[PDB]
Amino acid sequence: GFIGNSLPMQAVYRVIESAASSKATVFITGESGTGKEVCAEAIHAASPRHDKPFIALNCAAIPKDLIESELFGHVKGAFTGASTERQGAVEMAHNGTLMLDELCEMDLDLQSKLLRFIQTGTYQKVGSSKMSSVDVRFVCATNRNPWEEVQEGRFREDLYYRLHVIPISLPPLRERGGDIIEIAHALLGLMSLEEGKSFSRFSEPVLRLFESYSWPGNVRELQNVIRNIVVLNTDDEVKLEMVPPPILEHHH
């Protein structure tokens, strides 16, 4: 779902294609705002299991005490809030690909249960001792340095080495050559549809700025900038005075 054919992305695409035909676990890293879920979905789409579900569990978007419920499910009444019985992400992903995003947010207890599941395919819903099993291909991602999480004792060493089979390090936006403006154009069209506008081009100073700024927030930051411009202005062309702070100030 990536856009562009910059040199560093070509290397990513080659690994995606080769990894897609394997069940080996992929472990994605990259700076804040790089496309970890885009990469995970692209692996699924290129894989023989592309017609089965792709499911992404963002471990940070969930209270830490509820990751286990979201991952493995829960029976009714398993904990005070368990209003009904819930199907886990592992069941939704059976025969497909499960992305464990922001994996280092799991507590050490859940990491132990996860490692068991990865080894065997067997799990239990929260609140039950009954075993079930599924078949998932795992893709993991983190914005931490996973080796550092291990050295600091926040992430299990056995789990790290079980999962870290096919690492993919995503190129930061600033290193992606022509991809920056290709992505920016796609976002310009999409945000224009969202907002009822009709932006179609960037002026040459805007092109130069977007192609020189360091984009510390990567593609998320570019999405914010394009959304800002389309929400706050009405024109066919993005002009330099429309670019929000502190892009220009920081750039200098």
Residue numbers in the entry: 141 to 392
Copy text verbatim from the article accompanying this structure deposition:
Here, we use X-ray crystallography to study LuxO, the central quorum sensing regulator in Vibrio cholerae and related bacteria. LuxO belongs to the subfamily of AAA+ ATPases known as bacterial enhancer-binding proteins (bEBPs). Here, we present crystal structures and in vitro and in vivo functional studies of LuxO that together reveal what is, to our knowledge, an entirely novel mechanism of AAA+ protein regulation, in which a regulatory segment of the protein prevents substrate ATP binding and hydrolysis by occupying a portion of the enzyme active site.
To characterize the mechanism of AzaU inhibition of LuxO, we crystallized V. angustum LuxO-C in the absence of ligands (apo), in the presence of ATP, and in the presence of AzaU. Rather than forming closed rings, V. angustum LuxO monomers in the crystals form continuous helical arrays with six subunits per turn. Indeed, the monomer–monomer interfaces observed in our LuxO-RC and LuxO-C structures are similar to those observed in NtrC1 and other AAA+ proteins that crystallize in closed-ring arrangements.
